Symmetry: D3
Subunit: 271 residues, 6 copies
């Protein structure tokens, strides 16, 4: 199992830029060609994202074309910026197991040593996340049926406060419902998130919980400054590899940079 995990693509419509000056569409097209030029090739690509920026259909058209051009099976989930209905219209083809129900988009993946769980934390008419009761009971079912086999969950919104002045108020509002599931299920050991446009990470019992940086713009973590900052600091994604018994995640820079070179002992410490 190798997984290329990106999120918060925030696609704009054909020939528009985020905020009028950040070319999210080019940036993402780059990321895609970047991803499908990887040497060690992932088994699938996950997008935990606010996939489009406004939830407009013209935006889904761009996303569909660009994400369509990835040479991998995709797993796609909605975000606060998404529109559940249109997400399903345009993207469901690229991720058939979302279903036909816009209001209950979710699915299990039982291909790898760790089962993957994809859920929709986004709630209509708000930035805040919400886990609905049918999401939770589906999740319980999945975890019970799964038994000892480890599980990881992908969701847009972080299930708990991370101390982020800007991002916490719009975290998953009823994230306790998931935290209680992790208490209930020892097999549940990863939860990965978007929304925060940052690599911020934590542990709750057996569960490693982390947000991902965005593919384009990022938002800094401030603790007592509520100013809605964003910046163009370096974008990356997470690769997830099953390593014997270990789920390991590593950051893979999406920035263009110098190198690599080879380490040489003689060059390292001359005499």
């Amino acid at each position: 199992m190798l997984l290329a995990h990106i999120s918060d693509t925030h696609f704009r419509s054909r020939g528009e830029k985020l905020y009028g000056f950040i070319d999210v569409n080019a940036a993402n097209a780059d990321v895609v060609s970047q991803l499908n030029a990887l040497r060690e090739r992932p088994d699938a690509v996950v997008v935990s994202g606010d996939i489009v920026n406004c939830g407009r259909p013209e935006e889904y058209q761009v996303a569909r074309q660009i994400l369509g051009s990835l040479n991998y099976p995709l797993y796609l989930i909605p975000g606060n910026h998404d529109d559940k209905a249109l997400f399903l219209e345009y993207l469901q083809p690229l991720c058939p197991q979302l279903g036909s129900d816009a209001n209950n988009m979710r699915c299990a993946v039982d291909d790898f040593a760790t089962r993957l769980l994809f859920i929709d934390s986004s709630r209509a008419g708000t930035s805040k996340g919400w886990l609905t009761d049918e999401t939770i009971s589906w999740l319980e079912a999945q975890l019970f049926e799964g038994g000892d086999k480890p599980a990881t969950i992908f969701m847009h919104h972080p299930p708990l406060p991370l101390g982020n002045a800007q991002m916490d108020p719009i975290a998953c509002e009823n994230g306790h419902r998931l935290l209680a599931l992790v208490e209930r299920f020892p097999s549940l050991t990863r939860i990965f998130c978007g929304h925060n446009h940052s690599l911020t990470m934590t542990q709750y019992r057996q569960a490693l919980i982390s947000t991902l940086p965005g593919t384009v713009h990022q938002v800094p973590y401030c603790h007592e400054d509520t100013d809605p900052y964003y910046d163009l600091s370096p974008a990356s994604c997470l690769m997830h590899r099953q390593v014997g018994e270990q789920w390991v995640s590593y950051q893979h820079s999406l920035a263009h940079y110098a190198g690599p070179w080879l380490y040489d002992e003689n060059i390292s410490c001359p005499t």
Copy 2:
């Protein structure tokens, strides 16, 4: 508790540059001025690193001066690139609780809600890590006599293989012995490491285990390829903050980049 956690500074002598072209001294001096210019100021700075590149005195001269210019208490642990005796001679004044025995440099910090444990995984004449008989014993003494207060460990070498072709054969060789301590002490919930020049993370039981990017040059994760790569992809560090019952770590970019701007809803989705 706010910790600025950097690693693998790899200082060189006054004249010199890493491999002849990477100006690690300048880059770290920048990182330093960067840190002590932060608006939300950390309580202390952790350097889990190969503080110097060759284990040379004039490298420690440079390190002492630059790290000395930080306006924070420091916690310094050595790496395989360090010289135990010289590390103590030059850096112990900047971190008195290392002791005055170069072979058992290690210490506990009890000021915060989570206990901090600093140890020396480096071993003379090999890049491999090793936990000395009584490092292990000292570790177990801290956890045994520590009760409920959660614990986090800083060591240079990662205590288990991560699937990194380059970095795994030079991980902490007897790391399974620390893993035995996490199996036995539910109290031990973070292990943070240098060595890998990368953010890669995994969990083992309650323990979040993660390596850090370097302050200057980075090394990419390859699973199949053993070629000793390094590159100049973006440097960052980890900020560790206590948020109620949670230890959260978030990546703080040390690159220079455009921004920040403020998010404006009308700019975000124009009509």
Copy 3:
């Protein structure tokens, strides 16, 4: 009184670039988000500009949207590149006190310790500036009624030659009419200009007279080379602050750059 003063935005139509390769539309959208993310927030924004590049209506649509997104009262004046009629159609809403008369767009602002005067120096069918007699007599009236209270004037074209081989021939052709006004009125003490895409400054009696750099591309000052150069050297704007009895103007970089850091005496001169 804090004033953010930009000019020569040179907007192109939706999805066009200046000269086919300079993205003035993105650059300006950046400037706008930059401006309305300032910490010390200006009381209003002035644009002395060639606001659009060709005077086409599609161009005014872009300008209207982008300038519209600023979170400040605007003061807007035409330039040689502008079309008086369309300027008034699209932008007058964003600057109501221009009037209903396209041919006599001007206004006084008596909010601050210094009165602000906004005038149209642009003349149809030419690059050269022209101050019409009704502009001058309005200006005399304003200056008389104003008495001792200091005045500053904003106009697209510089009222005198600045020794610029390219820019002088297309300076304000009858700028003497204004120079004579400054001789007449001691209270008239600033005149600020666009057109030159440069910070070039001078003094005539009591009057500080300066052109501003553009928000995107710039044009160098050559003394005996008439070649119509332009470049992408760094863009900035002028901030104007009333400082007790002094009108002070300072350059505020619109470029993205490293820093800031804090000055530390110890880091400055080590021992």
Copy 4:
């Protein structure tokens, strides 16, 4: 008359960099080669600066060599970062008319249509400026015996507050005494300064008063914030040219940037 006016070079010793990471020596060497490569060559170069950073001899060694490599007559005045005695020892050979008394370094230049006045506002053991009893007297002697010929003054410290939180308390403390000279001598029409690492400008009576950006690092203008910031926003200098009766100053970027291209009307507005 064409003057290349740079300021605040802040040289360091041969090995060293400003604050450990800003390579001021390289940057100035570049600025130098830049200047003596100009197509329209200035008649002289003014450095109003803190020529060196620490007042150290080996800094003056570096400065002497780099400034010595300019292919122009020089006018050098000290700043608060300079050492009066050492400034004279190392730099007086590159600017003989400073005299040979380190405490009254000052001189008039009578070659051009405007008289040039160079003075030393620096004062031992404070960052504050100060005009010595007989600097003031010498100033007034030049203006009194000078008749109609216009005068411009170069001094390191700005002679009045500019509203800069950082820079104002360290302006020229008795600067009002020079202001008294401008009230009394209509002949004195430019005052140009270093210190602020910024282009900020104001007028007092006939006098245009402006500070300059530094050749390397800059300091931003804050009104409310006293935090001692510096940053690496674009460096530039001022070119001063005599154009008939006018002294004009225009900003010459010292950054490296794309361009120039030629303006083509058909490329500008395609059909």
Copy 5:
């Protein structure tokens, strides 16, 4: 004779990017303004190119406008990416001597000391090059009639293998037909090519044969790696100057970079 020789522009349609992220349209518009801002001005511009990327008419519209804006006579030839019919519809006006026959686009230029020969090596429905028999016999005629006067040939595809794993298989498939012409004709002494997006060069008897880098993206030369790489390494073009008896070609960078400065003996080796 001065010739500015560019190729493989790969224009996309209005408001599209190559692969979704490389702005070939802006890049080329830059190149054009760059070219027609040259100080030593070429006599004509040659484009050996894959002029558009997909051979769509909307793409030819962009190419026609941008290439149209060059201030030089053009010589234009098709490539594998081109569509012969549409090439002739849109571009023939900018290069009248292509003819009216889309299937036999070629021409001689007898203005300079060296005769220039322009031919179409592109073949419908393939990437491979093909020299048709009527191309060859026209070429023989031209070479015979030409006598002793030297000749150079411009064609999209390289007439022989260059050892390039990616590019060789799609080289000119029957390039032997041209190689045999060079054996036959001593006056034929240059052959210049596109396709390879690289400066790779060789000699066959009297003939210097070289491919050109592209104006935007480039493709590296690999010898036994067939992976279809491309990169954004620096773009350049070739200038061709008749220098007495010598045809000389030099690379002219199309990248934006620092300088130039002037070499100074004293600055070069200080004492």
Copy 6:
């Protein structure tokens, strides 16, 4: 046969930078690490260069160490910036077949399908090139006794004028004498040179003659302008590979740039 051919490294002393600001040492160290990190590894490295800038010993110290760190056999020839005696003292151990007579440093290489000829065109006390009486004789001996085996020559100075205003008067003064050898020996088919810091190429009979860009700074070709320019446009080198009967040379960029990605036909032309 694969050759990595670089030129004009222009090393400086340990502390120093070229002209005070170009860090040639770092740049070359980078170029070095770059080269010995190549995936398709050359058989040897050619440096046709002005190996050092001033002909100083401490420059040769630096060069010896950096060039010494290459993991390839080297072929080193001097340029006008070199000192014959010191070049031999420091570099002959890295290239034994130069001999031990500093005035006739030269050698043949017979390992590959094409014979390699290395000579010293430099002449004490002038920038001009010169082929010593018996360099010429030795050259003719190699070609005479060499039969059919093709020959290529590496010399610092170009053997004929190239129309370069700056570089021509300092070409190889008696270069016509080598040209006489190509007229007489059809066997001699490549001449490769340094000196010009540029890729300029021409053919004379069977001989492809080309100069190389420098590893660091470049000099532009001007025909009319004699101003001694240099700039920092992109550095590259030449790779020489034997491909059947062909010697092919291709430019290998040494800049750091975005890419590579893989060409995907569907991404290239979307529907």
